[PDB]
Amino acid sequence: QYYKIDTKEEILESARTLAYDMMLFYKGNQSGEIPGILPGPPTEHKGDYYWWEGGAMMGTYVDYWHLTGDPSYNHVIMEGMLHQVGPNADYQPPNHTASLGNDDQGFWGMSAMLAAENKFPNPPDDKPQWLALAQAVWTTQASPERHDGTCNGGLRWQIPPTNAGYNYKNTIANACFFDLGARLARYTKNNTYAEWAEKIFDWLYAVGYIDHETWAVYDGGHVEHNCTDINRAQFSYNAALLLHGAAFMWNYTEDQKWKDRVDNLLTGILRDFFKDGVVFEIPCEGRQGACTADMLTFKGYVHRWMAVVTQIAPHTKDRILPVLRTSAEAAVKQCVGPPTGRRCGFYWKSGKFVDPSVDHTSGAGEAMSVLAAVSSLLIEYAEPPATNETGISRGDPNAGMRSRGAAQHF
Numbered sequence: 001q002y003y004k005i006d007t008k009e010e011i012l013e014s015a016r017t018l019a020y021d022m023m024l025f026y027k028g029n030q031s032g033e034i035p036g037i038l039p040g041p042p043t044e045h046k047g048d049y050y051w052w053e054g055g056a057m058m059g060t061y062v063d064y065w066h067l068t069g070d071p072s073y074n075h076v077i078m079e080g081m082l083h084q085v086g087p088n089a090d091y092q093p094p095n096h097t098a099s100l101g102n103d104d105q106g107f108w109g110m111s112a113m114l115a116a117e118n119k120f121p122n123p124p125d126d127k128p129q130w131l132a133l134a135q136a137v138w139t140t141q142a143s144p145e146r147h148d149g150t151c152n153g154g155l156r157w158q159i160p161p162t163n164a165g166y167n168y169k170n171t172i173a174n175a176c177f178f179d180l181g182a183r184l185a186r187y188t189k190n191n192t193y194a195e196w197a198e199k200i201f202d203w204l205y206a207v208g209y210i211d212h213e214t215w216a217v218y219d220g221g222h223v224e225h226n227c228t229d230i231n232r233a234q235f236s237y238n239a240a241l242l243l244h245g246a247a248f249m250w251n252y253t254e255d256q257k258w259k260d261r262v263d264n265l266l267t268g269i270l271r272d273f274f275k276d277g278v279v280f281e282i283p284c285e286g287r288q289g290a291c292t293a294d295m296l297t298f299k300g301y302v303h304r305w306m307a308v309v310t311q312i313a314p315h316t317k318d319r320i321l322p323v324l325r326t327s328a329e330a331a332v333k334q335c336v337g338p339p340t341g342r343r344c345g346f347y348w349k350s351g352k353f354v355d356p357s358v359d360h361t362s363g364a365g366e367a368m369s370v371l372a373a374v375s376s377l378l379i380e381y382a383e384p385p386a387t388n389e390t391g392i393s394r395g396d397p398n399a400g401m402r403s404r405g406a407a408q409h410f
């Protein structure tokens with residue numbers, strides 16, 4: 001194996017090298033390129049990756065700096081995050097309408113939220129601030145036209161009604177909105193965020209995307225079947241995001257119901273996604289060549305989000321941290337690929353490097369996921385997410401409410 005992770009010093013060094021290798025995929029800080037995105041989209045034959053994955057990358061680097069103290073990439077990341085905000089400072093840039101799903105917008109919002117929680121340096125005074133960007137995403141997601149009576153509520157996957165998939169009310173869209181609301185409640189101490197988060201979680205439970213018996217977390221259902229045609233694929237990031245938001249709700253509310261939800265979601269995740277201590281993407285990983293570019297990034301979110309759960313729901317620490325350690329050990333074991341001797345693949349549990357070309361990408365998601373897993377080994381040494389008591393970001397009471405905002409011509 002190339003990377004060492006047995007001590008704090010070794011983990012820092014490994015994370016710094018992993019941060020370098022992941023950055024090689026990113027061209028957006030170079031002359032003539034677009035900040036904030038990885039190469040793509042594949043629909044234009046520009047590269048393998050969609051817009052939302054750029055937002056995921058930004059958040060991974062906000063976390064990297066928080067966990068390691070290394071600010072080397074902070075300028076590049078601030079530039080990327082700011083470039084993609086759109087004219088209404090809401091992460092709805094219209095050039096990206098095809099990529100405008102509530103989830104895609106949500107991931108950008110979550111990265112802004114993370115920047116506020118982590119005290120990431122503020123943008124210039126005349127630019128949108130991190131908390132305000134998170135508030136704008138949440139506000140647009142709470143807008144009445146996104147909450148119709150079909151399936152008794154819930155967000156649709158897509159924002160534009162003409163986007164393919166507008167008829168799919170899926171877990172990830174709702175989980176993003178839930179997680180933002182829970183996080184905004186904790187940061188701002190404003191209970192209206194929390195009331196929305198409660199409502200959306202209760203909807204996910206009622207519609208049966210959360211299994212009442214096992215606490216498995218399914219993918220979604222379609223409005224023309226009243227959401228009853230549940231797609232029971234279990235993607236790791238769905239359960240993990242609900243766990244993350246539930247942990248923020250437990251920390252904010254101190255309500256035993258939320259502690260029980262954390263515990264039940266966590267039991268399910270350990271049962272379903274961790275295979276002898278290693279995270280495993282159950283709908284696709286069992287054979288090579290099935291995971292999409294998006295799926296290759298999920299395990300990295302699992303690691304980062306579960307690590308934060310241990311800070312804000314500290315009773316979970318002993319269930320989570322040993323398992324994240326075994327999973328990260330497997331991640332680095334297989335980061336041995338040519339031509340560098342340290343290239344990372346996806347198939348951690350297998351114990352073997354598999355070239356990312358088997359899944360038809362250059363390998364940025366796998367690189368991101370290992371970076372996430374290794375960095376998050378430092379969670380014990382990191383500060384917990386800040387609230388407005390110690391944060392440095394600023395909000396906006398009219399975030400998401402501009403008169404030129406897209407909701408005004410829906």
Ligand SMILES: OC[C@H]1O[C@H](OC[C@H]2O[C@@H](O)[C@@H](O)[C@@H](O)[C@@H]2O)[C@@H](O)[C@@H](O)[C@@H]1O
Nearest residue numbers: 050052101103104170172219235294295
């Ligand atoms: O990969 C599982 C995932 O697949 C579909 O959404 C894929 C992917 O689309 C991107 O554009 C972005 O929206 C991202 O969040 C999403 O993962 C969909 O069927 C979804 O429900 C499912 O979880």
Ligand SMILES: [Ca+2]
Nearest residue numbers: 099100101104
């Ligand atoms: Ca999308």
Ligand SMILES: [Ca+2]
Nearest residue numbers: 047048360361
């Ligand atoms: Ca490709």
